[PDB]
Write a protein that binds this ligand. Structure first.
Ligand SMILES: OC[C@@H](O)COc1cccc2ccccc12
Length: 288
C-alpha cells in the first residue's frame, strides 16, 4: 500500500513517502534524517489516516535549490503550507522532530487553522528554545555544535570516509541499541548519497542565534503570536544530548492545552528508538 513520489510546491520538487487514506497525517523530519525515520508511525496510523512523510528540501531525493536564501524559515514554512494544500487538504495533524519541529512549531503558531493537532518530538520550541539559550549554561554547552556548523570546514567531517561523521552520529548508536536494522542502515547511507550535506547545513547558516543582539529577541524565528491554542502533545527523549529538559519548563504559558510525555530512556529520536511506546502515547492523544 506504500507509495513514494514527488510534489511541486513553492518552486521545488519534494520527494515524499505516502500510505493509507483519509485525514492527513503529515510528518516532518530533521537533521540528519529523512522521511524514513517515521516508518513505524506510517505502518501504524495508515489505516486511520493518510500518512505522508516528507523529505525536506535538500534532503535525500528532494530538489536541492542553491543559496542560503532557499533555506530561510519563511521559505520552509511556506513549503509546508503549500504541501497540505496540494495534497488536497485545508488542514492536517502535524507530527514534527528536530528541524521539522522548528519549522512545524512556527507553522502552527502562524497558521493554527492548518493544524488540527500537533505532535512534537525533541526539537526547538520558538520561545523556550531562546530562553534556555540565554539562561541555561548546559544548553549552551549543548548547542555549541551550532556555532560550529557555521564553518565551511564542517561538511568534510561529515561526508569524509563514507560519511564517518554522520555514521557515528546516528548509525552506530542505533545499530548497537537495536533500533536500526541493516536495511535501515542502507536506507540512511543512500539518503546521504542522494541528498546534499551542504543544503542540510544551510538550514543552520540562517539561524539568528549568535550575535548578542540576536539572542535578545523573544522567538527563535519571528512570530506575531505568542500563544498556540490547538491540542499539542510533546513526546520527549529525556536523554537527548542536544536538548536540555528545561526546554519543556513553563511551556503551557506558550501552549495552553498541551500534554507531555517524557521517555526517561529514549534520547533524541524517540519515534524510532521506542516505537511502540511513542505509538501508544500518540493513540491516546489522538483520541482525547
Ligand atoms: O535551545 C535551543 C537550541 O536547541 C537551538 O537549536 C536549534 C535551533 C533551530 C533549529 C534547530 C534544529 C535542530 C536542532 C536544533 C535547532
Amino acid at each position: 500500500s506504500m507509495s513514494k513520489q514527488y510534489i511541486n510546491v513553492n518552486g521545488v520538487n519534494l520527494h515524499y513517502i505516502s500510505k493509507g487514506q483519509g485525514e492527513l497525517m503529515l510528518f516532518l523530519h530533521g537533521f540528519p534524517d529523512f522521511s524514513h525515520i517515521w516508518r513505524h508511525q506510517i505502518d501504524e496510523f495508515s489505516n486511520d489516516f493518510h500518512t505522508v512523510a516528507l523529505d525536506l528540501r535538500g534532503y535525500n531525493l528532494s530538489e536541492k535549490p542553491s543559496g542560503l536564501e532557499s533555506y530561510e524559515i519563511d521559505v520552509l514554512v511556506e513549503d509546508i503550507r503549500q504541501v497540505i494544500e496540494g495534497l488536497g487538504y485545508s488542514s492536517c495533524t502535524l507530527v514534527v522532530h528536530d528541524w521539522g519541529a522548528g519549522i512545524g512549531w512556527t507553522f502552527a503558531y502562524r497558521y493554527p487553522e492548518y493544524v488540527q493537532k500537533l505532535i512534537a518530538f525533541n526539537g526547538p520550541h520558538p520561545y523556550t528554545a531562546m530562553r534556555e539559550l540565554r539562561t541555561n549554561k548546559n544548553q549552551q554547552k549543548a548547542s555549541e555544535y551550532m556555532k560550529w556548523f557555521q564553518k565551511q570546514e564542517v561538511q568534510d567531517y561529515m561526508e569524509r570516509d563514507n560519511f564517518s561523521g554522520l555514521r557515528k552520529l546516528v548509525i552506530d548508536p542505533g545499530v548497537k541499541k537495536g533500533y536500526l536494522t541493516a536495511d535501515d542502515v542502507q536506507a540512511y547511507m543512500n539518503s546521504w548519497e542522494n541528498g546534499s550535506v551542504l543544503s542540510m547545513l544551510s538550514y543552520y547558516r540562517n539561524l539568528k542565534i549568535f550575535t548578542e543582539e540576536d539572542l535578545r529577541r523573544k522567538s527563535l524565528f519571528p512570530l506575531e503570536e505568542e500563544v498556540l491554542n490547538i491540542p499539542v502533545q510533546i513526546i520527549w527523549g529525556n536523554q537527548d544530548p542536544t536538548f536540555m529538559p528545561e526546554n519543556l519548563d513553563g511551556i503551557e504559558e506558550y501552549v495552553p492545552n498541551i500534554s507531555v510525555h517524557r521517555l526517561a530512556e529514549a534520547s533524541h529520536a524517540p519515534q524510532h528508538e521506542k516505537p511502540q511506546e511513542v505509538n501508544n502515547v500518540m493513540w491516546n492523544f489522538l483520541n482525547k
